[PDB]
């Protein structure tokens, strides 16, 4: 794909609502698609000003499978989708009743990926790890990719690590849709490592770094 | 509650997204809070114009427990919440993988209830009853109300009736929050009947009528 | 149904396993099918002797919809099933990860119903309400009955009440199968009240009383 | 662990019930614990004689993490558990409503592992892949192992491959308990490949081969 180069730029815009708290997020990043790495800086603006009202980790994974190292042989569903574009839909089912739904569109112009998302979370316990910001980040995960009904699906039981050392379970279910038909890959897995680094006390300013590599199973 | 009268008016505004389709909804209605009845007319405007892209039944229940006939003895959690106001958070877990999250705020001025909501649905099968608009409406349901952690929770396994006669299961989980502390009711059930009537072919123009009555259990 | 009389007797046998603890249960009861009431006494024998290792409430609902007051007009799926017999399959999905599956067969000879069941529970938290026997009984519930694929299904979000006053959620999903085809009823609800009374300290000896009435919806 | 040798033998006994169909299973196998491999032959005897009434794949994973290649550095929760023994509890939540619960105990005498299990499945659609025996086997999976409340938990979204090429989703949740306290490992993943080979037309006679390797994450 002559459209996806070795070095890419990214820009993000998110409109969201968690437990009634409205917010918007802006971000900018840089990435190496073939190497499976990317880093970005985000700014969360709560509708009512003030610090981030919940754990940024519920948003991190929403902020691009094109940033995955795929073996040169295997069909790269994500890379093939450009320049037409892709849409993503993800369900997050947390173990304590909290549920978040997120949907986003990724477009590309030149070396720049524009990511526009909508995020909505409800029913998180007022004192749980999400609302109390007790999480540290996602443990490495192996997302199972399967082809289902012409599109690629991703399923994985992920874990958000907690301050004291515990873990908080989240089931992820995602639909990866392409604007145009692409050559489908075989069922596989994507190993991902995502690290979050708060830049300010409130957590409104934050950095994310991710490394992802696909494995033939 | 001298604040809630025998005849009330309602106005609605919804911002939503289902399977990537953005839309907004406006509505107006009239209701009898003590009698447990209400009727309203809505107008859906898809971001990209055109007919309603999915079943309006996924939105109907989002569009006010104040419209419930409660025995005069029993604490009315909803009526007591005004004029301060209330917030609602509902998770809809559909049997075929579709998930919708919705959150809304209800305020009151004089005899008018203003309802502002956000709705987000993802992962609905492209050919399921929701996206193909194959539903007719919700069967009558008995929502179980329980008090949990200072707020009222609602849980119920509901069924969306289908054109050919079948049914499509949906698990509802809702948090009913009041702006100010109110006298809590005992665990109870709310029997509800909601009827949808399309006013136009596309379904963008639609009427809803609902009857709800609380029962001591 | 000349086969189901006004006064019936019941006998029960259950083989079960909960969290690795094997046990058997024997019971005997009396009931009034048309009145929707029944009472029975059970004896639990843990494989390793000793007191009941978990809350009997997880078993109570396993121990006969024939004991439901149905309007004379409405098809009685359960009563019509005899004398041929019926089989039941129920999934119990508890809110804290515990899951129980149960299957049973009911046969009839004269005025006596023989109930043979198998119960299996796993993953209950070692310190949860089930293993610590912190429950008091089920709150009244409204089981939604729907016809699906030639058989009757029952769905309901039930609540087990806890000693201190709290509640523990359980989603029930049941398949009610008849040995022979019967006239199907319309979707309806069954209101049930079940009361448990421990006869001994260990809870191995226990009494159950239930009242159920069907309602056209 | 001088107790677990390079070559081990295995014997199995299972008592089960799926959709009302009672059965028992006997088996014998050989394995290489340090190499992470094992092979066994099983014989299913349906209570009512006749061919296997459902897909053997729902049972395969029930039939020993000791057969996993663990890096010599990392604590091997399973190997350390012997000779005292271990107990397992697994919940299988299938995508089409079928649910199976299974619990088993593994003991060791000399070079022989004795595996005694109980399996119970209910609510599988009469025409689904399980009851119609339309599955071919499990796709390779990465089970996430986490330490929770003194015991090891396993969570994974697995997929049963279907005859025509499709896949059928199953969420697995397992508790791995040891008779005696052992040194806990860090959160990790176990990559497993299990292959089923029917030895007879009915599928009552079947062979299983599995390869598992643990990975530090």
Contact D142 A140 (CB under 8 A): no
Contacts of residue B110, defined as CB under 8 A and 6 or more positions apart, other chains included, come to: none
Tell me the nearest-neighbour CA distance from A31 into chain D, angstroms.
Answer: 23
This PDB structure is determined at a resolution in Å of 1.7
Instruction: State both tokens at C217.
Output: 């919806």
The stretches of D15-139 forming alpha helices (DSSP H) are: 57-60
User: How far does CA B161 lie from the centroid of its chain?
Assistant: 17
Interstrand relation of C141-148 and C151-162 (parallel, antiparallel or unpaired)? antiparallel
Distance CA A14, CA C12 (A): 59
Q: Which residues of A touch B119 (CB under 8 A)?
A: 120
Report the distance separating Cα D162 and Cα D134, nearest Å.
Answer: 6
The Cα-based distances of A129 to A23, A48, A169 in angstroms read: 19, 22, 11
Spatial distance between the Cα atoms of A10 and A113, rounded to a whole number of angstroms: 5
* Cα–Cα distance measured from residue D88 to residue C18, given in angstroms and rounded to the nearest whole number: 12
D19 part of contact set with chain C, CB < 8 Å: yes
Alpha carbons C81 and B135: distance in angstroms, whole number: 32
- CA distances in angstroms from C71 to B195, C38, C63, C183, D214, listed in the order given: 26, 18, 24, 15, 60
Determine contact, residues A29/A13, Cβ cutoff 8 Å.
Answer: no
DSSP D57: H
Residue B183, both tokens: 């006298």
- Do residues A33 and A6 touch, judged by C-beta distance below 8 A? yes
Beta partners for B204? none
- Answer for the pair C111, C5: CB distance below 8 angstroms, yes or no: yes
Which residue in chain B is spatially nearest to A102 when comparing CA positions? B122
C91 → closest Cβ in D17, D20, D99: D99
| The length of chain D, given as a count of residues | 217
Cα end-to-end distance, chain A, whole Å: 24
Helix (H, G, I), strand (E, B), or coil: what is residue D197? strand
* CATH for the stretch C1-217: 2.40.155.10
- The answer to whether the beta carbons of residues B135 and C213 sit under 8 Å apart is no
Q: C74: distance to nearest CA of chain D, Å?
A: 26
**How far D151 CA lies from chain A's nearest CA (Å)?**
13
Cβ–Cβ < 8 Å for A10, A26: no
The encoded tokens of residue D187 equal 């959160």
A146 vs D contacts (CB less than 8 Å): 159, 167
Query: What one-character-per-residue DSSP string does chain B give?
Result: -TTS-SSEEEEEEEEEEETTEEEEEEEEEEEETTTTEEEEEEEEEETT-SS-SS-THHHHTT--TTSSB--SSS--TTGGGTTT-EEEEEEEEETTS-EEEEEEEEEEETTEEEEEEEEEEE---TTSTTTTT-EEEEPPEEEEEEEETTEEEEEEEEEEEETTS-EEEEEEEEEEEESS--PPPPSEEEEEEEEEEESSTTSSEEEEEEEEEEEE-
d(CA D53, CA D132): 8
In chain D, alpha helices (H): 57-60
Indicate which of A136, A137, A142, A193 best probes the interface with D, i.e. most D CBs within 10 Å of its own CB: A142
Local structure of D100: helix, strand or coil:
strand
Instruction: Specify whether the CB–CB gap between A39 and A29 falls below 8 A.
Output: yes
Return all residues near B1 (Cβ < 8 A) that are at least 6 apart.
B76, B79, B80, B82
- Taking contacts as CB-CB distances below 8 angstroms, the residues of chain B near C155 are 157, 169
Rounded-to-integer distance, Cα B160 and Cα B96, Å? 12
Give the chain C residue nearest D18 (alpha carbons): C103
Q: Three-state DSSP class for A66?
A: coil
What SS3 state is found at D138?
strand
Closest residue to A122, CB basis, from B103, B121, B149: B103
Distance CA C122, CA A62 (A): 34
Q: Kind and range of the H or E element at A60?
A: helix A57-60
Reduced to 3 states (helix: H, G, I; strand: E, B; else coil), residue D208 is: strand
CA distances from D42 to B76, D62, D200 (A): 61, 12, 11
Residues of B in contact with C159 (CB under 8 A): 144, 146, 187
D interface test, pick of C59, C89, C104, C124 with most D CB neighbours within 10 Å: C89
Domain spans, chain C? 1-217
Method: X-ray
The residue among C205, A159, C137 whose CA lies nearest residue D144 is A159
Return the C-alpha torsion angle A17, A22, A28, A31, nearest 10: -10
Contact B144 C141 (CB under 8 A): yes
Provide, as residue numbers in chain B, all residues whose Cβ is less than 8 Å from the Cβ of C139.
144, 187, 217
C-alpha distances in Å from residue C154, one per residue of C65, C85, C177, C186, C189: 11, 18, 11, 13, 9
Which subunits sit against B, judged by 3+ Cβ pairs under 8 A?
A, C
Three-class HEC string of chain C: CCCCCCCEEEEEEEEEEECCEEEEEEEEEEEECCCCEEEEEEEEEECCCCCCCCCCHHHHCCCCCCCCECCCCCCCCCHHHCCCCEEEEEEEEECCCCEEEEEEEEEEECCEEEEEEEEEEECCCCCCCCCCCCEEEECCEEEEEEEECCEEEEEEEEEEEECCCCEEEEEEEEEEEECCCCCCCCCEEEEEEEEEEECCCCCCEEEEEEEEEEEEC
Instruction: Determine how many CB atoms are found less than 10 A away from the CB of residue B45.
Output: 14
Pick from D98, B146, B153: nearest CA to A97: B153
Gap between the Cα atoms of B99 and B18, Å rounded: 10
Residue D5's CB is within 10 A of a number of other CB atoms, namely: 12
**Which residues are A116's β-sheet partners?**
A13, A105
């Amino acid at each position: 794909n002559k459209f996806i180069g070795d070095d890419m730029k990214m820009t993000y815009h998110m409109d969201g609502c968690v437990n009634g708290h409205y917010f918007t997020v802006k971000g900018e990043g840089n990435g190496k698609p073939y190497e499976g790495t990317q880093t970005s800086t985000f700014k969360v603006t709560m509708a009512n000003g003030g610090p981030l009202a919940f754990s940024f980790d519920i948003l991190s994974t929403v902020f691009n499978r094109c940033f995955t190292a795929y073996p040169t042989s295997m069909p790269d569903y994500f890379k093939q989708a450009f320049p037409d574009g892709m849409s993503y839909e993800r369900t997050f089912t947390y173990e304590d009743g909290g549920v978040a739904t997120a949907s986003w569109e990724i477009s590309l112009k030149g070396n720049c990926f524009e990511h526009k998302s909508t995020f909505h979370g409800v029913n998180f316990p007022a004192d749980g790890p999400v609302m109390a910001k007790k999480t540290t980040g996602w443990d490495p995960s192996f997302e199972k990719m399967t082809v289902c009904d012409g599109i690629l699906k991703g399923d994985v039981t992920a874990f958000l690590m907690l301050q004291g050392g515990g873990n908080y379970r989240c089931q992820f279910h995602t639909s990866y849709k392409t604007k145009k038909p692409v050559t489908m890959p075989p069922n596989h897995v994507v190993e991902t490592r995502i690290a979050r680094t708060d830049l300010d006390k409130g957590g409104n300013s934050v950095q994310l770094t991710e490394h992802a590599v696909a494995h033939i199973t």
